[model samples]
Target: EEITIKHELGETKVKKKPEKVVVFDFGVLDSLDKLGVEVTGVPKANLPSYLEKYKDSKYENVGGLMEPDFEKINEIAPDLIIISGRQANSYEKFAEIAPTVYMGIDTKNYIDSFANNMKTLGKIFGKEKEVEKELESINKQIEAVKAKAEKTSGKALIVLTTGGKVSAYGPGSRFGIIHDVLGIKPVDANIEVSTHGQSISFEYIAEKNPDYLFVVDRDAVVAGKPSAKQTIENELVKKTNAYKNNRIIYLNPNYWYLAGGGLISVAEMINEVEKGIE
Candidate 1:
């Protein structure tokens, strides 16, 4: 069985059940996992702790998110190859080995991008009904969580820290889901950071004086630290309202950085925030 998927790039004819699929982005893997699809290959770096169930699975290692092992990918002989963000730029290269589709990362316009990716994946896998059901379920969860978050009385700050330097994320940064999904109010929504994020001094954070702080460790994942919780517990953060009031939330660096707004990661993040507030 097969279906024709019309997308922003173009239309693609895909098999209803791809026997061997390679996912370049963890977001793609999460989406496919939600749809009950098995991926044959994925990058080993920065996978969620929960994904350890597949550690010894038959999947091939395709390098890190920024770089994929082309030779290993070609050996997989996948029927479909899913890439996202800058990884999409390698479409021409991967297309030579298999039918490739570049599903943009769910960074900006997260809900829309996720929905489109689900719909596109549905069309390819001939599982439109399943995709629709998942979307509806996710929408209901969001509505329930938003009601509680909307009533919260504090502004939140999402920050990425590397080498003890802080980079703040606003509504437009890579981790825009703080505003987009969970409805967390940004303390400095107007601060225009780079596409990734902007470096700020401790004084900047103190000035913001946000009630809540969400920290994403930019270096811990590469350094393979046990966790970022301890790294962020320094004197600077300890002096902030978030830390003083025990409102500092340290999220899994992999999910926060790599997965971004995928359904599973986003849902888990919402649960985390809800629990934190409670």
Candidate 2:
């Protein structure tokens, strides 16, 4: 089946149901894997622990996320190619090799954009019903979780800990879901929005005094090391209301950082936050 998918760059007319897929994005990979789509190859670096099997398996390693091995991909000659985040800029080059799609999160409008991407995948894989089912299930879970989260009182601060440095995320930041979907208000609604988040110090966090502090360990996911918990143990952060109330929740950086999309991971993301609520 052929379909027209208007993605980040432009509309792409998929010729048919792709049999051999090469996904460079982790979220798309997770979604395709859940949709039971057989993948032919993927870029080999920065892979999640669950997908570590690809390292030793017969799966072809097409290089890293930032630089996809064009030579290797050409050899495999995949029917469909998927790219997000880091690879979005190189969309033109990849399209020369095969039918490529770029579907990164909208950031500001995550669920709606994610659903559009999901529908695109469903059309290509002939799994529209399954895709809709997962979408319905995810929305239902969101509504239920949002209700509980809303009742939990107090403003929350979303932060990303990377390389021992801390950056605060607000309503328009990547972690906006923490405030938007979950109905947990942000300590500061107006933060300087950036693709890299707003860099801040421990003193800043202490001064904000959020009721709940949600953190994502970027270093753990990117470099397999500990994050905020280690560096944030200092006196400044310890005095925050979140710390005193034991509301400084550490998130599973793997799914949250590496692949915070896909049907399986989306609800799992909500579940992770829900665990820290009550």
Candidate 3:
């Protein structure tokens, strides 16, 4: 049997329970991995540590996240190909090879979009029950965190530091889950929703004076080094309550940056927020 998947790009027909699948989105790959679905190829570069198992020779390394090896993908002859925002521009090319589905998360409508993507994967893989079970558990966890967040008087500021620069994120942004879903108040609710986040200086962070400061270190993930801690905790940032109050929570870039919107990553993200809120 075949099913038609309607995504951001367009609709494509996919064979149900496709055995040979190539995935470019880490979140989709995470969901597929949880559902016990076997995949043929993936862009294995920069895979999160939890997914390092895929780096083994058993799976074909298609290429980087933003750039896929078309020749390798074509040779794999996958029955279905899955992608996200990174591979959006190559949709037509991937569809030319096999049935392709876009699984990019909508930051503004994170929960619903994530649920829709999970359900789509379930329908395609005949794992609806498992998806529903996972979704139910996640919803319960979200409610638990939301309850705690509502009673707290603290406000949060999320920042990403890379190359000695910092950017802030708030509701409706890529890292909006803490504010939008879990009900944690943003220190600056007006932060613009953008892919790269709002550009800000260290002074801006101190000026916000948030009760909680969540840091996502891009250097740790991209540059293969840990530097955000030393860079973010300078004298300029020490004036904030988050600094003195011991609320500068360093988030794992593996989940927030590279592999969010997946079943496992979402759960871990919630856990991190739950711990930080208290």
TM-score of 1: 0.89
Give the Å error, residue 4, model 3. 0.8
> What CA RMSD would you report for each candidate?
2.3, 1.4, 0.9
Q: Model 3: how far is 145 from its true place, Å?
A: 0.7
Q: Give the Cα error of residue 158 in candidate 1, in Å.
A: 0.5
Largest lDDT belongs to which candidate? Answer: 3
lDDT of 2 by residue, 1-278 (tens): 67777777887777667878898877788888788887889877877765665576677889888878999999988888989888878898889898898988887888988898899888888889999999999999898888987786789998888777888888867778888777887899988788668899987888888888898888886777776688776787898888888988998776787776678778788898888887
Error of 2 at 47 (Å): 1.2
Model 1 lDDT tens row, 130-245: 88887787788778877888987788898877766677788866776667677788889876656557778677888788888888876767666544565567766678888888
lDDT of each: 0.74, 0.83, 0.91
Residue pairs in collision within model 1: none
Name the regions of candidate 2 deviating beyond 4 angstroms: none
Give the clashing residue pairs of candidate 2, or none: none
Please give the lDDT score for candidate 3: 0.91
Q: Which residue window of length 10 is worst by lDDT in model 3?
A: 42-51
